[PDB]
Amino acid sequence: TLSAEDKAAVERSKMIDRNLREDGEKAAREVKLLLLGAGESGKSTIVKQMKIIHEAGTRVKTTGIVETHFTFKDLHFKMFDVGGQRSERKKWIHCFEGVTAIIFCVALSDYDLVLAEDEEMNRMHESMKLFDSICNNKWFTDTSIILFLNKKDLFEEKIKKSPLTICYPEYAGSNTYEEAAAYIQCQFEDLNKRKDTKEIYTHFTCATDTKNVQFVFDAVTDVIIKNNLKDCGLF
Amino acid sequence: SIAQARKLVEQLKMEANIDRIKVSKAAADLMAYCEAHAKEDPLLTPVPASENPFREK
Amino acid sequence: YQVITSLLLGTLIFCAVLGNACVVAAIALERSLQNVANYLIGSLAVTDLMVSVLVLPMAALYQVLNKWTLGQVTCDLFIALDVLCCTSSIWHLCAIALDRYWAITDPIDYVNKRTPRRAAALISLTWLIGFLISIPPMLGWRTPEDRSDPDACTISKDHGYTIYSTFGAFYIPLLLMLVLYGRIFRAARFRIRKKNERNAEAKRKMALARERKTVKTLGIIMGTFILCWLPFFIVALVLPFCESSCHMPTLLGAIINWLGYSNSLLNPVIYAYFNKDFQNAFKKII
Amino acid sequence: DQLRQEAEQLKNQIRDARKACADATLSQITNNIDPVGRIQMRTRRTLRGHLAKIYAMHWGTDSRLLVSASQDGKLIIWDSYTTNKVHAIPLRSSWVMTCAYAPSGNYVACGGLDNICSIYNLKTREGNVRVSRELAGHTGYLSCCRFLDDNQIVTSSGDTTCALWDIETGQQTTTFTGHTGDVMSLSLAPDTRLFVSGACDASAKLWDVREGMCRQTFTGHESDINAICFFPNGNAFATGSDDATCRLFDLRADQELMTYSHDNIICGITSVSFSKSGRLLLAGYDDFNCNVWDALKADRAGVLAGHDNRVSCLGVTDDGMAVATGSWDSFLKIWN
Numbered sequence: 001t002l003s004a005e006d007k008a009a010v011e012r013s014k015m016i017d018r019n020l021r022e023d024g025e026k027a028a029r030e031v032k033l034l035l036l037g038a039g040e041s042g043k044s045t046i047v048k049q050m051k052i053i054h055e056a057g058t059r060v061k062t063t064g065i066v067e068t069h070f071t072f073k074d075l076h077f078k079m080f081d082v083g084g085q086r087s088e089r090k091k092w093i094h095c096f097e098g099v100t101a102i103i104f105c106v107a108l109s110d111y112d113l114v115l116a117e118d119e120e121m122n123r124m125h126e127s128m129k130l131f132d133s134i135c136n137n138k139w140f141t142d143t144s145i146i147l148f149l150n151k152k153d154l155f156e157e158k159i160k161k162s163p164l165t166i167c168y169p170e171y172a173g174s175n176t177y178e179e180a181a182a183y184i185q186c187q188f189e190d191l192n193k194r195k196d197t198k199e200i201y202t203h204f205t206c207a208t209d210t211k212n213v214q215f216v217f218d219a220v221t222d223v224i225i226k227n228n229l230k231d232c233g234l235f
Numbered sequence: 236s237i238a239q240a241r242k243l244v245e246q247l248k249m250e251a252n253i254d255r256i257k258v259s260k261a262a263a264d265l266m267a268y269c270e271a272h273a274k275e276d277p278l279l280t281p282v283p284a285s286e287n288p289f290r291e292k
Numbered sequence: 293y294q295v296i297t298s299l300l301l302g303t304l305i306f307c308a309v310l311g312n313a314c315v316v317a318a319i320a321l322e323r324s325l326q327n328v329a330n331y332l333i334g335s336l337a338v339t340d341l342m343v344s345v346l347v348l349p350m351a352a353l354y355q356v357l358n359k360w361t362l363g364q365v366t367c368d369l370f371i372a373l374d375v376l377c378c379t380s381s382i383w384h385l386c387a388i389a390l391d392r393y394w395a396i397t398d399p400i401d402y403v404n405k406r407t408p409r410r411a412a413a414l415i416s417l418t419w420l421i422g423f424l425i426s427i428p429p430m431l432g433w434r435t436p437e438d439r440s441d442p443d444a445c446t447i448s449k450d451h452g453y454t455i456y457s458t459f460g461a462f463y464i465p466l467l468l469m470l471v472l473y474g475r476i477f478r479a480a481r482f483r484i485r486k487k488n489e490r491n492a493e494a495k496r497k498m499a500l501a502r503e504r505k506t507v508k509t510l511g512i513i514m515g516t517f518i519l520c521w522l523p524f525f526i527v528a529l530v531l532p533f534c535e536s537s538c539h540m541p542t543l544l545g546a547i548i549n550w551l552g553y554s555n556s557l558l559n560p561v562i563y564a565y566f567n568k569d570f571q572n573a574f575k576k577i578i
Numbered sequence: 579d580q581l582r583q584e585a586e587q588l589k590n591q592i593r594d595a596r597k598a599c600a601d602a603t604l605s606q607i608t609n610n611i612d613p614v615g616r617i618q619m620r621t622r623r624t625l626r627g628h629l630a631k632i633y634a635m636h637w638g639t640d641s642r643l644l645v646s647a648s649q650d651g652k653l654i655i656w657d658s659y660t661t662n663k664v665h666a667i668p669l670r671s672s673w674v675m676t677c678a679y680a681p682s683g684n685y686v687a688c689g690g691l692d693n694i695c696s697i698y699n700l701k702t703r704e705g706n707v708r709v710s711r712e713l714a715g716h717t718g719y720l721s722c723c724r725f726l727d728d729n730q731i732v733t734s735s736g737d738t739t740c741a742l743w744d745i746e747t748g749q750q751t752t753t754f755t756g757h758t759g760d761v762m763s764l765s766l767a768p769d770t771r772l773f774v775s776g777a778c779d780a781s782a783k784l785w786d787v788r789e790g791m792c793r794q795t796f797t798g799h800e801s802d803i804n805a806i807c808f809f810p811n812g813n814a815f816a817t818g819s820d821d822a823t824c825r826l827f828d829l830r831a832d833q834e835l836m837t838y839s840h841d842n843i844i845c846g847i848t849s850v851s852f853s854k855s856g857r858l859l860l861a862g863y864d865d866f867n868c869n870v871w872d873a874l875k876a877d878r879a880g881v882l883a884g885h886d887n888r889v890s891c892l893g894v895t896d897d898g899m900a901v902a903t904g905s906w907d908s909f910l911k912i913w914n
């Protein structure tokens with residue numbers, strides 16, 4: 001009670017609590033994004049582009065989860081890459097509940113290619129199944145998804161050479177970059193079961209340095225504004 | 236995937252050579268251990284507040 | 293016949309106190325409801341509780357007895373508490389509107405520089421405006437007509453004080469709230485507006501539903517504020533200037549006087565008893 | 579090849595031997611034991627300070643100090659007697675889903691989505707906690723870790739293997755392989771010669787620390803196992819799974835004894851622990867409730883309601899005075 005040791009213990013507890021509160025306030029000022037996608041789906045390219053101008057604002061190599069810390073327009077972003085996590089997603093996907101948005105990356109040029117596990121499995125079909133699984137989890141019901149369609153030029157060359165009917169037999173239209181890209185985009189967007197709660201922002205990755213991060217910033221600001229409107233009761 | 240089959244069958248044949256006892260004896264041993272230390276379990280029998288560290292000093 | 297009036301007033305104070313106290317308790321005992329918006333809503337609930345505990349009983353006694361039987365000093369205390377607490381309730385409404393406007397129109401400020409110190413500053417400014425409106429009639433600047441009739445507790449009817457108090461307590465807040473909520477409405481509409489045919493039809497229907505909801509909610513807020521407080525301030529701005537030829541009917545005058553206090557009862561319903569988080573917290577407490 | 583035929587033959591032989599060794603169920607033996615009765619526990623301490631979901635906790639051997647891990651990248655050493663934060667260790671990676679307290683009370687460990695088990699030195703010359711060593715080598719998320727001694731630590735990860743580490747050197751002394759799914763839980767025997775691990779392949783295995791081989795295999799569940807804990811005797815253990823069913827397995831009998839299930843619960847178990855005498859089996863559930871089970875009767879004796887989101891971790895002191903449950907609402911609660 002009044003002993004010196006008890007006073008010292010209470011003082012240390014109060015100091016630690018103040019430090020914890022300060023760290024929590026500092027961490028609450030950060031926007032968290034989850035990066036997903038197939039293996040060779042252009043994930044690293046998007047990470048490099050986002051960190052080209054802004055990076056980080058005897059440790060052992062982790063390779064489990066990779067954090068990218070970049071700031072744009074006075075807004076702090078954190079991206080978590082779980083590509084190297086080879087295990088069941090069901091056991092740790094709930095750790096990312098509460099992220100502002102999910103950055104899903106899929107390559108347009110792998111529709112012709114097939115997985116190495118078996119020949120009769122399209123890579124784009126694997127990406128679609130992953131998108132369906134991650135867009136309808138019980139944890140990400142309120143979380144918006146930012147969809148990036150990488151490798152537009154390779155896809156254009158491939159559809160110039162090879163037709164799109166192999167990946168989508170039901171498809172019936174002219175083989176052109178615009179129409180095929182629109183078809184792929186709408187096919188990915190039709191997997192969103194929670195139409196009323198979440199929204200999908202689709203962008204085609206471009207060689208310009210700042211356009212992709214600008215699109216991400218616009219999507220995050222739109223998500224924040226719509227969440228505020230919902231809290232206020234006007235949305 | 237045939238090399239792992241040999242390891243699996245070796246593990247199975249190794250797991251089947253252990254001595255086993257009757258379930259009645261094991262249940263009796265568990266019950267005896269439970270009843271022997273029942274007096275020393277503060278959770279089973281609520282402790283008086285005089286010597287309860289988490290309520291009163 | 294006075295028994296009916298007494299029981300109606302008593303149940304009015306009882307409901308107001310119960311609602312405001314429930315809102316304050318729910319905010320206090322829940323960790324989930326501890327953000328800036330709920331802090332402002334809780335301060336508004338506390339102000340309404342002060343109106344219902346410190347002002348409504350004396351006003352109800354005045355209504356029932358149809359005369360003031362408590363004293364001149366008690367009359368001054370009642371007037372000061374009445375002007376201070378009710379002006380505060382209005383400026384809490386304006387502060388909530390301002391916070392919503394800042395959150396909706398400035399996401400960067402919402403993420404970075406939005407801290408509970410902002411809520412504390414807004415509450416302090418509201419109470420400071422309340423004091424600036426309530427104090428000066430006490431420190432002079434009051435006509436002797438207030439003390440001329442001992443069997444009455446009317447607010448000072450000086451033209452300058454009437455203009456000052458009415459403007460700074462209802463009319464400046466009204467314009468501020470109208471401008472802020474108009475900007476908020478424009479922002480909401482801009483956000484909403486911005487087989488393939490089935491998806492397009494579904495999106496159009498969803499946009500129409502959201503537009504109807506963002507019209508209804510804004511209408512509820514603004515209409516409640518207007519229909520609660522506007523008639524009394526129109527009366528208080530018109531009658532003092534026109535001393536004669538503007539007799540006020542007793543029943544209509546009493547209804548106009550007592551309409552303003554219903555805002556302190558309807559405020560928790562609109563700002564607290566509607567959002568989902570408060571309902572979940574109340575269900576958990578129940 | 580044709581080895582599947584002899585494999586299934588050996589499986590049938592093992593099942594036949596287990597059925598032959600089973601004569602009377604545990605329910606029949608303990609029919610004459612009087613019921614434990616209703617167990618009423620009231621919250622005694624509420625430990626506050628975490629700002630995110632809590633995934634693990636562990637009690638010290640002195641039964642006064644406990645450690646908790648949460649998503650805010652903090653590892654807090656509490657003082658359960660006075661609710662005083664003794665330490666607050668900032669983690670390099672905020673994705674942590676396990677923690678352990680050394681038996682000597684000198685070290686504390688944690689691990690998570692990053693595949694590294696970090697060892698923190700508590701008692702140092704300057705009084706400031708510093709990273710003693712980082713243990714790398716797993717290829718999946720680290721699910722559990724237990725200090726076998728002041729120098730040896732055993733870890734279980736999501737790469738379907740468990741490993742024994744030497745903290746002084748930092749290399750894997752022994753690797754335990756054989757699981758066909760992610761290993762989610764681990765518990766050490768009181769004599770620290772064997773340990774059991776429950777994995778996502780709906781099976782639990784008994785390992786020998788020195789030999790590094792799977793001694794026995796237990797398969798009763800229908801879904802992945804999220805928790806495990808030895809009986810205080812050291813000859814039995816209890817597992818919790820997403821099937822919403824806790825089971826008691828016996829090492830000597832090499833089979834299943836009791837099933838703890840109720841029709842009103844359909845949510846999986848996240849944590850399992852025993853009382854000091856072994857009569858009470860406490861389990862945490864996904865419906866933010868904790869149920870106290872009669873280990874010898876399979877009848878509920880109480881409910882430790884009071885949490886909000888989900889009870890994720892649970893533990894019982896060595897002296898048995900108190901039970902601490904941590905949940906996703908960022909609160910530790912001491913029950914007693």
Ligand SMILES: C/C=C\C/C=C\C/C=C/C/C=C/CCCC(=O)O[C@H](COC(=O)CCCCCCCCCCCCC)COP(=O)(O)O[C@H]1[C@H](O)[C@@H](O)[C@H](OP(=O)(O)O)[C@@H](O)[C@H]1O
Nearest residue numbers: 231232233307310311509512561562563564565566567568
């Ligand atoms: C002619 C054409 C068109 C016009 C005709 C018809 C249509 C319109 C008519 C006019 C409208 C009248 C009132 C409608 C109210 C109504 O619909 O209420 C909805 C249903 O809630 C309940 O049922 C829950 C109710 C709980 C009530 C409180 C319980 C306690 C009361 C006593 C308290 C004191 C004693 C304890 C809830 O609200 P809502 O759907 O109206 O919409 C919003 C609300 O307006 C926003 O304020 C709120 O934001 P907040 O400011 O943070 O709260 C939003 O979250 C959202 O709820």
Ligand SMILES: CC(C)CCC[C@@H](C)[C@H]1CC[C@H]2[C@@H]3CC=C4C[C@@H](OC(=O)CCC(=O)O)CC[C@]4(C)[C@H]3CC[C@]12C
Nearest residue numbers: 507508509510511512513514515516519520554555558
């Ligand atoms: C203190 C006394 C006055 C009791 C409180 C009454 C209020 C709760 C009333 C007064 C005016 C009403 C509003 C008058 C008109 C409308 C528009 C109405 O809009 C529609 O759905 C269709 C018409 C349109 O497009 O405006 C929705 C209800 C609302 C906001 C009403 C909600 C309830 C209000 C705020």
Ligand SMILES: CC(C)CCC[C@@H](C)[C@H]1CC[C@H]2[C@@H]3CC=C4C[C@@H](OC(=O)CCC(=O)O)CC[C@]4(C)[C@H]3CC[C@]12C
Nearest residue numbers: 297300301304355542543546547550551554555557558
């Ligand atoms: C927000 C919802 C719940 C509606 C709120 C309604 C109130 C504004 C009502 C409820 C009881 C009403 C009172 C009930 C009875 C009387 C007495 C009545 O007596 C008179 O002086 C009339 C003339 C006479 O008979 O001499 C004057 C109105 C008044 C104060 C009423 C004023 C308006 C009150 C406060």
Ligand SMILES: N#Cc1ccc2[nH]cc(CCCCN3CCN(c4ccc5oc(C(N)=O)cc5c4)CC3)c2c1
Nearest residue numbers: 351354355358359374375378379447457458461528549
């Ligand atoms: N002007 C102004 C002005 C300016 C700026 C302001 N800010 C805040 C206010 C306060 C607004 C409400 C004032 N109260 C007093 C009048 N009312 C009342 C109640 C019972 C009654 O009973 C009798 C009877 N029995 O005769 C008569 C009578 C009258 C109830 C409402 C204000 C006012």
